[PDB]
Design a protein around this nucleic acid. Sequence first.
RNA 1: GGCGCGCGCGCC
RNA 2: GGCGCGCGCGCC
Lengths: 160, 162
Amino acid sequence: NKIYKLMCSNCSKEFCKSIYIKKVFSNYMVFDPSVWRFLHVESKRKVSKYLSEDNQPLSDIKCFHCKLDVGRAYKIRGTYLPQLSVKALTFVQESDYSSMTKAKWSDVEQDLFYISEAIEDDFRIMLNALSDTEENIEKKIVLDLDSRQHNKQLEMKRFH
Amino acid sequence: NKIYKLMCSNCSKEFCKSIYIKKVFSNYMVFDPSVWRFLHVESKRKVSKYLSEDNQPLSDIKCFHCKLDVGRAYKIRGTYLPQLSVKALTFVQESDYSSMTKAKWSDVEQDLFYISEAIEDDFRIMLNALSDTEENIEKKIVLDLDSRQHNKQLEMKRFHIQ
RNA sequence: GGCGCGCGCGCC
RNA sequence: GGCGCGCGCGCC
Ligand SMILES: [Zn+2]
Ligand SMILES: [Zn+2]
């Protein structure tokens, strides 16, 4: 099986391996709890127009090193998960000298690696990943605050 | 200012170098007369809804090797030219060992290489690019038949626009 | 925010 | 058919 590293397209720092990308209703999310070490998390100070219980778009995520925006964090199935934008990535096959960028995830699926559907075990691995250390807790506070704001609008819409 | 190879995303066969792509009113056409060796030209049997004298979308073009559809040929200012679709292409930078796919010809300009607007000089090398071998003549015949059908529809549109 | 898809207008 | 705008739909 060919494993790829997923790198920032701008500064070439590594975010995670391809084996951690899994789909939830066509949202391509990262299920390596280590990936948060390589992301700044910042509030948009604007709740999503998409309001649902099971799939909540929350804080933006930036490359830890070059600070470009690289996607968005979500709460999906009650779990915090990053979604890296395919346009922010460069793919390198382990032990090869080539690099590839793709316009669409479907090109990644056809040309690089199969992406499977996430299962409940994958969500459980990511739960509470942002715990215990100063660096993690800062990020958790930002997600938690954005989630509270999201839920406030959600409940408000559903009031009537 | 890197040069890129434009390849079939399906089978990796090379069609041409990036320096041969030039725009005509945001149509990104190939002006390498050699490119036709790498394309099959297949009639569509259905005239475009866009009818004009100077920019006629005509026969489909397919990868010579794998026969995937890769775009469409046009007659532009009286000259036949291939339009490769960005969706069927992988761009490769040989020296960097890098390859890229792009959603729009517009992202190719932004991210990969400058594309100039075509001038009259560019058309001259393409003028008789299909007139020199048995195989190229057979492509020209397909294009001319599709052009004749296009013109015939155009006549009618011009006519009862009145 | 992701993924897929319609329709209309403009230039060619 | 290309490119640029608009408006909208489905699933999450
Ligand atoms: Zn970076
Ligand atoms: Zn091919």
